[PDB]
Amino acid sequence: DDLDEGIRMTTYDQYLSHIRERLHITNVPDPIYITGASTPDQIAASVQATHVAVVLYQSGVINGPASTYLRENEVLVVMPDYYDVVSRFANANLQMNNNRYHESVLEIADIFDQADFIQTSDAVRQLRALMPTLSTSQIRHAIERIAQITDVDSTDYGKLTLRFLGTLTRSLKMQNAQIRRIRPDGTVLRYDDQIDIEAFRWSRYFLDELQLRRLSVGLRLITNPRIARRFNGVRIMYLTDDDPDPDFVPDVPEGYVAVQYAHRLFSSSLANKRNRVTYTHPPTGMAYPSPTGRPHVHMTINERAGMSKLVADNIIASVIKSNWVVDILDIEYTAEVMTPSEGYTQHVDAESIMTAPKGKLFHLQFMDGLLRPEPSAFDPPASGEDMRLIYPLQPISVARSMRAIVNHNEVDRPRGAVAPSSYEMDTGTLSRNGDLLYSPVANG
Amino acid sequence: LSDDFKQISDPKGYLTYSVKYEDQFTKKDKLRASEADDRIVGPTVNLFKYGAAVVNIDLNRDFFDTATGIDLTKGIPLVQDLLVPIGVTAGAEQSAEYVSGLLMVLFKVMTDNRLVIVGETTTPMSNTLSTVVNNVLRTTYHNNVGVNPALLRDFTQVNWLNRDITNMLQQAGTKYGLGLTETRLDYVRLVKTIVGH
Amino acid sequence: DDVGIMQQKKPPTVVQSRTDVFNEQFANEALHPTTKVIFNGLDVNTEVQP
């Protein structure tokens, strides 16, 4: 049994943050402790109470069954930082192994039954995963400038003022807050119903409920394949420009070897006078000075930030004559797939693909190819081939709804032509609430 | 009162359809249709000229106008000086400009407090317009229609289509149909009734 | 699937010269497909057949 078919466990910090504050509000007595002793009964009784199916681990080996009971039940077990997390369990039959993961999101709601606190979704991790980790000073700025676009001039917001001192400015990070009330000793009380409001137990995000709704709806939109229009890794490969679909990445033949690029390879040695920038080829040390004749290498670039304007060029140079396939895995450009009739303009030259700063997300533009009309039957034959280098490592054109609206020979669909997807015109009812859903498929 | 909403007439969604047409193709048989149906399947097929190559579902600046930053153009939203590297100077066409195009926009959707008002709907009745389009229409279609792959069926020359449309809105599910449906609410009041379009 | 008729546009032709001994430093290799003609222009095929 593979992927999402074992035991799940998450780091204590994750558990604290997101899942723990919720536990305090329902009242149900805090979790139980995965201990070496505790039998399948203890785990059962604990989840029978908190009724959330989470067990906290802080006692030697888990051993004996129960651990098995855990396979039987989600009961994600939370535990301090990962490592030796197999030396913890007693997989008395070798299966556990500190290296088998399907690191997954587990949208919180699939843990709590009283979903009146749970909100938003796994869609956010998708998004924050992209945000470049910001600093407190950084956020003051992101916020200060959003509020600015909103038109609500913000000043002394979050700061302080007190004359005599300066106007020292507190921070603004905050993640999730709970307007918990503090015992006199200045240290957070555990939210109690008969003493503090009922509008404080669990504060959404300080976002009015109606407002919260278009937000799940929005992030839903943001985290959508058809709006992920900022791709990554280009491949650079020599080849004959023949293929309509732009979302076509030339696969790599049988021969080619996988070499992870690094500075260690390309030394600078002497061979026949001249200092040819030899490449060494890890598999079997064999410096090959002259670009031409290297040995069918598949170059993978991850770095690309420490190339000398020449070692890199030579490598690109070798791409040409040697069919080396170099994959620049770190670039983030934006495609275009713009029709043949007015083909190209912004000309990326090979020198630039290679030396561009890590930031700059340059626009590229692949050909539409499919809508080009057959060349004549008397067109003067073309002598020399067209060469194409840049390829897109992942499937571009997602924005594509339909494409190739034109008859082939007056009945057959041209190849590569798309036709719109059913779901994009299945306009069905509304639920027994408001959410508009598709049409049944004759099964409710 | 408190302006917690804006009643607009004919709403503008987020994603749209944008088509690029090689401009040298053009079936020459000319298809002319009922004057009325030329008004339903009016824009739809017109936008959908015979010879458009790649069609994309942009985000549409019409709604995400530069008035909020998100200066679209490239498929990427691309906000601007939102989350810069404090202490320097942006970085002409940076990459994070975009993580951020994504942010203000989620934020815009975050707050689209606008209400809708039926606007200048029209009603054609059978005979006026075609049979095909007619099932699609349930009476009083909004006067300022939109555009939509189906409804373009048996009105478009692209011969293969009527294999992916005239046999698409043919399966069990996917029952197309613009117009004015029955929405459970139907006769609920307010300060006007509510219709469902 | 129809003969041109119109006048489509093609990828610019960079001319490769390849002289007895030429020196090979392709460092500007433009990425968008291009057609490389070895002989200076010369396509010579002009004798219309009415």
Partner: peptide, 26 residues
């Protein structure tokens, strides 16, 4: 002529509700 390229985006009109002076139901 020389086979041109062309693009068109899908229009957009959202006038802000034209307040009318006529009921339409008794």
């Amino acid at each position: 002529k020389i086979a041109t390229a062309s693009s068109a985006r899908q229009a957009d009109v959202e006038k802000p509700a034209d307040v009318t002076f006529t009921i339409e139901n008794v």
